[PDB]
Design an enzyme around this catalytic site. Structure first.
Site, PDB file in Angstrom:
ATOM      1  N   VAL A 229       0.824  -1.201   0.000  1.00 37.86           N
ATOM      2  CA  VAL A 229       0.000   0.000   0.000  1.00 37.86           C
ATOM      3  C   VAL A 229       0.863   1.258   0.000  1.00 37.86           C
ATOM      4  CG1 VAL A 229      -1.844   1.242   1.198  1.00 37.86           C
ATOM      5  CG2 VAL A 229      -1.766  -1.254   1.273  1.00 37.86           C
ATOM      6  N   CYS A 230       0.753   2.031  -1.068  1.00 41.05           N
ATOM      7  CA  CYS A 230       1.526   3.251  -1.229  1.00 41.05           C
ATOM      8  C   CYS A 230       0.597   4.460  -1.249  1.00 41.05           C
ATOM      9  CB  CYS A 230       2.325   3.171  -2.533  1.00 41.05           C
ATOM     10  SG  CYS A 230       3.380   4.600  -2.883  1.00 41.05           S
ATOM     11  N   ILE A 231       0.007   4.786  -0.106  1.00 45.67           N
ATOM     12  CA  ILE A 231      -0.988   5.843  -0.069  1.00 45.67           C
ATOM     13  C   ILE A 231      -0.408   7.106   0.526  1.00 45.67           C
ATOM     14  CG2 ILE A 231      -2.980   4.318  -0.029  1.00 45.67           C
ATOM     15  CD1 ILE A 231      -3.186   4.769   2.971  1.00 45.67           C
TER      16      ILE A 231
END
Length: 165
Positions: A88-90
Protein backbone atom coordinates in the site's frame (compact mmCIF):
# COMPACT_ATOMS: atom_id res chain seq x y z
CA UNK A 1 11.03 1.50 20.41
CA UNK A 2 8.11 -0.22 22.12
CA UNK A 3 5.59 0.43 24.86
CA UNK A 4 4.17 3.72 23.62
CA UNK A 5 3.61 1.95 20.31
CA UNK A 6 1.85 -0.98 21.98
CA UNK A 7 -0.28 1.34 24.14
CA UNK A 8 -1.16 3.35 21.02
CA UNK A 9 -2.33 0.17 19.31
CA UNK A 10 -4.23 -0.79 22.47
CA UNK A 11 -6.06 2.51 22.22
CA UNK A 12 -6.68 1.75 18.55
CA UNK A 13 -7.86 -1.70 19.62
CA UNK A 14 -10.32 -0.56 22.27
CA UNK A 15 -12.01 2.13 20.16
CA UNK A 16 -12.16 -0.18 17.16
CA UNK A 17 -13.81 -2.74 19.43
CA UNK A 18 -16.17 -0.24 21.09
CA UNK A 19 -16.94 1.87 18.03
CA UNK A 20 -16.46 -0.30 14.91
CA UNK A 21 -16.19 1.81 11.74
CA UNK A 22 -18.11 0.69 8.68
CA UNK A 23 -16.21 -1.09 5.93
CA UNK A 24 -13.24 -1.86 8.22
CA UNK A 25 -12.61 -5.07 10.08
CA UNK A 26 -9.21 -5.38 11.77
CA UNK A 27 -7.51 -7.09 14.68
CA UNK A 28 -3.94 -7.96 15.82
CA UNK A 29 -2.23 -11.21 14.85
CA UNK A 30 -1.96 -12.77 18.32
CA UNK A 31 -2.57 -10.41 21.25
CA UNK A 32 1.04 -10.88 22.28
CA UNK A 33 2.54 -9.32 19.17
CA UNK A 34 0.42 -6.23 18.56
CA UNK A 35 2.94 -5.08 15.95
CA UNK A 36 0.96 -6.71 13.16
CA UNK A 37 -2.76 -6.59 12.47
CA UNK A 38 -4.97 -8.15 9.82
CA UNK A 39 -7.76 -6.21 8.17
CA UNK A 40 -10.69 -6.78 5.87
CA UNK A 41 -11.37 -3.86 3.57
CA UNK A 42 -15.04 -3.95 2.75
CA UNK A 43 -15.32 -2.23 -0.58
CA UNK A 44 -17.24 1.07 -0.66
CA UNK A 45 -20.82 0.64 -1.77
CA UNK A 46 -21.82 2.29 -5.05
CA UNK A 47 -18.28 1.82 -6.33
CA UNK A 48 -16.33 -0.65 -8.44
CA UNK A 49 -14.94 -2.18 -5.25
CA UNK A 50 -18.27 -2.65 -3.35
CA UNK A 51 -18.80 -6.42 -2.98
CA UNK A 52 -15.03 -6.79 -2.66
CA UNK A 53 -13.59 -7.94 0.64
CA UNK A 54 -9.90 -7.13 0.48
CA UNK A 55 -7.76 -8.70 3.23
CA UNK A 56 -4.58 -6.94 4.24
CA UNK A 57 -1.87 -7.00 6.88
CA UNK A 58 -0.57 -3.98 8.77
CA UNK A 59 2.98 -4.14 10.07
CA UNK A 60 3.74 -1.73 12.89
CA UNK A 61 7.32 -0.51 13.44
CA UNK A 62 9.23 -0.07 16.69
CA UNK A 63 8.89 3.63 15.88
CA UNK A 64 5.12 3.93 16.24
CA UNK A 65 3.37 6.23 16.66
CA UNK A 66 6.19 8.54 15.53
CA UNK A 67 6.65 6.79 12.23
CA UNK A 68 4.14 5.50 9.61
CA UNK A 69 3.25 1.79 9.67
CA UNK A 70 3.54 -0.68 6.83
CA UNK A 71 0.55 -2.13 4.99
CA UNK A 72 0.00 -4.70 2.26
CA UNK A 73 -3.01 -6.42 0.71
CA UNK A 74 -2.64 -10.18 0.78
CA UNK A 75 -4.91 -11.15 -2.10
CA UNK A 76 -3.19 -8.36 -4.12
CA UNK A 77 -5.13 -5.50 -5.75
CA UNK A 78 -5.05 -3.07 -8.66
CA UNK A 79 -5.05 0.66 -7.96
CA UNK A 80 -2.66 3.50 -8.97
CA UNK A 81 -2.09 4.68 -5.38
CA UNK A 82 -0.94 1.15 -4.57
CA UNK A 83 2.21 -0.72 -5.59
CA UNK A 84 1.83 -3.50 -8.21
CA UNK A 85 3.52 -5.71 -5.66
CA UNK A 86 0.39 -5.30 -3.54
CA UNK A 87 2.06 -3.04 -0.95
CA UNK A 88 0.00 0.00 0.00
CA UNK A 89 1.53 3.25 -1.23
CA UNK A 90 -0.99 5.84 -0.07
CA UNK A 91 -0.49 9.54 0.41
CA UNK A 92 -1.53 9.62 4.06
CA UNK A 93 0.57 6.59 5.07
CA UNK A 94 3.52 8.40 3.56
CA UNK A 95 6.11 10.44 5.39
CA UNK A 96 6.54 14.22 4.92
CA UNK A 97 9.51 14.26 2.58
CA UNK A 98 8.88 10.79 1.20
CA UNK A 99 7.22 12.25 -1.87
CA UNK A 100 9.11 11.35 -5.06
CA UNK A 101 8.57 11.63 -8.82
CA UNK A 102 7.47 15.26 -8.97
CA UNK A 103 4.69 16.30 -6.59
CA UNK A 104 5.15 18.47 -3.52
CA UNK A 105 4.85 17.92 0.23
CA UNK A 106 2.01 20.45 0.24
CA UNK A 107 -0.32 17.47 0.04
CA UNK A 108 -1.57 15.56 3.07
CA UNK A 109 1.03 13.33 4.68
CA UNK A 110 1.89 11.48 7.92
CA UNK A 111 0.29 13.40 10.78
CA UNK A 112 0.76 12.81 14.56
CA UNK A 113 0.12 9.14 13.64
CA UNK A 114 -3.54 9.88 12.82
CA UNK A 115 -5.50 6.83 13.92
CA UNK A 116 -5.88 3.38 12.31
CA UNK A 117 -9.55 4.27 11.92
CA UNK A 118 -8.59 7.48 10.08
CA UNK A 119 -6.00 5.62 8.01
CA UNK A 120 -8.30 2.85 6.79
CA UNK A 121 -11.11 5.35 6.16
CA UNK A 122 -8.61 7.11 3.92
CA UNK A 123 -8.20 3.73 2.23
CA UNK A 124 -11.99 3.60 1.78
CA UNK A 125 -11.97 7.13 0.37
CA UNK A 126 -9.27 5.94 -2.02
CA UNK A 127 -11.41 3.02 -3.17
CA UNK A 128 -14.65 4.93 -3.80
CA UNK A 129 -12.74 7.93 -5.12
CA UNK A 130 -9.73 6.63 -7.15
CA UNK A 131 -6.81 8.92 -6.42
CA UNK A 132 -3.74 8.54 -8.61
CA UNK A 133 -1.38 10.08 -6.07
CA UNK A 134 2.19 9.60 -7.35
CA UNK A 135 1.11 6.60 -9.36
CA UNK A 136 2.82 3.74 -7.56
CA UNK A 137 1.20 1.45 -10.09
CA UNK A 138 1.83 3.29 -13.35
CA UNK A 139 -0.08 0.64 -15.28
CA UNK A 140 -3.06 1.13 -12.99
CA UNK A 141 -2.92 4.92 -13.22
CA UNK A 142 -2.47 4.69 -16.98
CA UNK A 143 -5.60 2.59 -17.48
CA UNK A 144 -7.45 4.74 -14.92
CA UNK A 145 -6.67 7.94 -16.78
CA UNK A 146 -6.96 6.43 -20.27
CA UNK A 147 -9.98 4.11 -20.21
CA UNK A 148 -12.01 4.21 -17.02
CA UNK A 149 -14.09 1.32 -18.39
CA UNK A 150 -10.99 -0.87 -18.33
CA UNK A 151 -10.15 0.14 -14.77
CA UNK A 152 -13.74 -0.45 -13.67
CA UNK A 153 -13.80 -4.02 -14.99
CA UNK A 154 -10.40 -4.80 -13.50
CA UNK A 155 -11.73 -3.48 -10.21
CA UNK A 156 -14.74 -5.80 -10.39
CA UNK A 157 -12.48 -8.73 -11.27
CA UNK A 158 -10.31 -8.06 -8.22
CA UNK A 159 -13.59 -7.92 -6.29
CA UNK A 160 -14.64 -11.42 -7.36
CA UNK A 161 -11.10 -12.77 -6.93
CA UNK A 162 -11.10 -11.38 -3.40
CA UNK A 163 -14.24 -13.49 -2.92
CA UNK A 164 -12.42 -16.34 -4.61
CA UNK A 165 -13.18 -16.33 -8.34
Amino acid sequence: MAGTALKRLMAEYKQLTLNPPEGIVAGPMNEENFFEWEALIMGPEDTCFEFGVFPAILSFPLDYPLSPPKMRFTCEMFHPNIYPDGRVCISILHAPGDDPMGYESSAERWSPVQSVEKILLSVVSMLAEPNDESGANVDASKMWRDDREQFYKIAKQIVQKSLGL
